[PDB]
Design a protein around this nucleic acid. Structure first.
Ligand SMILES: [Zn+2]
Length: 609
DNA sequence: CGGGCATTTAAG
DNA sequence: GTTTAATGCCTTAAATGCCCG
RNA sequence: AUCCGGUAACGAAACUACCGGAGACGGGUUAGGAGGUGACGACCUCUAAAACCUAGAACUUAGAGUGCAAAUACGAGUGUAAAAGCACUCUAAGAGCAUUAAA
């Protein structure tokens, strides 16, 4: 959609007297969701043993908003049913609420207490987006990773059947593709006869029981197999990181937290004086009513209502007076053909240290209702992507690569590791975290194993949260975001200054054929006049200045520019089997020695030309 | 002897 | 510890629990 | 102790060796540049900073500007006398993020 973000620091945006509440809210929200997520996961596994294989006479357990909302209430110590009024349809809520409450009494090894989980902020609206995000994560995990569970089970089933792991991939690969497009799948859902892969999107809750069983089978059925091959998956996501997470603040959410009667009454005077209209507000109860009730008549258009929302932010924040206002005041970017004008969307995502502003197109501002000839002159380049070496660009005579170490130095990986360990060791958490919680695997789907991790953490939860709340940890998150741009931008600049001029030598490379030299003599003065051949597999930022095209990667690691076939193979017959040394298999070759970076790039460039 | 304020839930 | 794939981007009326000059 | 370029054994690999260059998150405190005598050096002075402490700022690349840091000649043997780096403003090109899972 037409929604974009501007990420900056939060200093100066919120007033000092209001910044205290925001920081407390971030900690309070994290604690509720982090503990609530564990409670929800524990309850599901209790019901998991109710039925497998799935019975045909009952429906599966499907989570909804009220499920998580009740979990949050239990964590905060609210033991009374949340049902408003009484009704036969609402009776189901009461039964579920008591069922989860009893689980809380057993998940933790001591009687619940109400005053140990005190909170004093109206986080009802803020937690709403977090609950939706958590439930969305459940759907995404189930609907987009089932095939990966199949691979793990099958590649362990082969080992259990006596096959050495050399043959496991031989059969597993075909089985996975064939079955997706043996007993790990449910009954066909779609009556239209579409392939089995389609059924995964029909309903995630049907496939969820299978994934849990796969985890239990990996832990019990395949216990004899090597633990390295049985690295556990996580069917049920939950918030684990102790670092406070970002929260979403809207016009309604901001109003609830930072508004009081003595402050709300001033809003009426300021609005009346500047606009000559008195708002229909008496107390905090009528603050967030509809526009028609507030002004007494229907708005002419959505934009009129939106302007009222912006004034709400203006009175409570320095939106129109802070440093960041420069980038939100109707900014138009120079090279947009449509000339889209952007303005603030009355929404903020922040974590106390960093703030992200939401900016939308001016054509939709308001309250939202629920619902090839250049190849002749262009200079060509070729590169083969990878992971040990991220990129390797060549012009046929010279090579440049974007090594992993380059980004590590740019992002200060070593310094960040040292600082984090030093701070943790000061509080004494190193001994407990490295020894106690290391053994207890949180990803385990066994009710016993998960309970032990949950209860062990509860004894050190308070210490852990305070230690990780230090701003140093949150500052590093901004640093990696900022420095990642610098590393890629510098490399892009280096590419231009390397191939911007003709090569000074045309004989160093023996394998350089006649075709290669033709593309090296052209001069190019602009980023957009360079075309880089790329593999099928950072590229998304490269395309912002450089033009790119796709070349097949098949057999590019063995083919040779000037040979009848794939003469290249990894070196063998030496004391040390090194990483990627390449050696030719026959004398009829231009170069008897090669490496993956040069070999792969040259073949791609040859195909490009 | 009365009236008033602030959370929170619900469907949309 | 880091990268890729996936989803998302929200408003307003009524119940009730509490409070004190 | 990592990164960049070259040398060898018909483009060597996280070590097979050698030669030339870059860099250490922010705030406190350290050694290096430069100056009364723009001799030399002694003390002082402007700037600045690795190991240690610390609830702690900041959209990114190319270039262009302004603006910094000041208190051996003569009279008869003998007395007087711009560097490292930083800040601001410009021109050109870019500019959506939160969470989970997976490898
Ligand atoms: Zn060959």
């Amino acid at each position: 959609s037409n929604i974009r973000i501007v990420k900056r620091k939060a200093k100066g945006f919120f007033k000092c007297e209001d910044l205290v509440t925001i920081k407390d809210a971030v900690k309070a929200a994290h604690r509720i969701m982090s503990d609530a997520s564990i409670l929800v996961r524990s309850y599901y596994l209790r019901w998991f043993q109710s039925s497998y294989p799935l019975d045909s006479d009952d429906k599966e357990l499907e989570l909804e908003h009220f499920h998580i909302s009740m979990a949050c209430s239990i964590v905060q110590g609210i033991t009374r049913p949340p049902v408003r009024g009484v009704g036969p349809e609402q009776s189901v809520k009461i039964d579920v609420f008591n069922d989860m409450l009893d689980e809380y009494k057993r998940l933790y090894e001591r009687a619940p207490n109400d005053k140990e989980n005190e909170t004093d902020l109206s986080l009802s609206h803020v937690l709403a987006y977090s609950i939706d995000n958590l439930l969305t994560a459940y759907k995404n995990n189930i609907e987009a990773h089932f095939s990966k569970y199949v691979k793990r089970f099958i590649r362990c089933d082969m080992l259990a059947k006596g096959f050495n792991k050399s043959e496991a991939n031989r059969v597993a690969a075909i089985y996975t593709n064939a079955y997706i497009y043996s007993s790990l799948f449910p009954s066909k859902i779609n009556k239209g006869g579409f392939p089995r892969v389609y059924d995964l999107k029909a309903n995630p809750w049907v496939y969820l029981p299978k994934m849990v069983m796969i985890n239990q089978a990996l832990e019990t059925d395949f216990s004899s197999v090597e633990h390295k091959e049985r690295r556990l998956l996580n069917p049920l996501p939950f918030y684990s990181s102790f670092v406070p997470m970002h929260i979403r603040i809207d016009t309604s959410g901001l109003s609830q937290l930072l508004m009081t009667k003595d402050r709300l009454d001033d809003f009426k005077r300021s609005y009346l004086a500047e606009f000559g209209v008195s708002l229909n507000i008496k107390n905090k109860g009528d603050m967030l009513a509809s526009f028609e009730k507030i002004f007494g008549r229907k708005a002419t258009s959505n934009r009129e209502a939106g302007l009222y929302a912006t004034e709400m932010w203006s009175f409570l924040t320095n939106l129109k007076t802070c440093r960041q206002w420069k980038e939100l005041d109707g900014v138009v970017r120079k090279n947009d053909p449509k000339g889209t004008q952007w303005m603030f969307d009355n929404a903020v995502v922040t974590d106390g240290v960093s703030i992200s502003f939401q900016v939308i197109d001016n054509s939709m501002f308001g309250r939202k209702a629920f619902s090839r000839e250049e190849l002749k002159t262009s200079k060509l380049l070729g590169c083969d992507p990878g992971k040990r070496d991220i990129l390797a660009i060549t012009d046929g005579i010279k090579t440049i690569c974007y090594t992993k170490g380059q980004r590590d130095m740019d992002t200060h990986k070593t310094i960040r590791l040292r600082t984090s360990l030093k701070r943790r060791r000061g509080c004494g958490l190193e001994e407990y975290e490295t020894q106690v919680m290391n053994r207890f695997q949180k990803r385990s789907c066994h009710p016993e194993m998960f309970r032990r991790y949950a209860c062990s953490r509860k004894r050190m939860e308070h210490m852990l949260l305070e230690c990780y709340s230090h701003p140093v940890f949150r500052e590093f998150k901004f640093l990696v975001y900022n420095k990642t741009k610098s590393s890629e931008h510098r490399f892009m600049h280096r590419v231009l200054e390397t191939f911007k001029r003709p090569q000074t030598n045309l004989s160093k490379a023996r394998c350089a054929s006649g075709v290669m030299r033709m593309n090296a003599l052209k001069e190019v003065q602009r980023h957009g006049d360079i075309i880089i051949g790329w593999g099928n597999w950072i590229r998304r930022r490269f395309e912002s200045l450089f033009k790119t095209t796709t070349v097949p990667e098949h057999y590019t690691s063995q083919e040779c520019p000037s040979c009848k076939g794939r003469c290249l193979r990894k070196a063998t017959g030496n004391p040390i089997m090194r990483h990627h040394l390449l050696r030719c298999t026959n004398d009829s070759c231009c170069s008897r020695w090669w490496n993956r970076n040069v070999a792969g790039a040259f073949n791609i460039l040859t195909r490009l030309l």
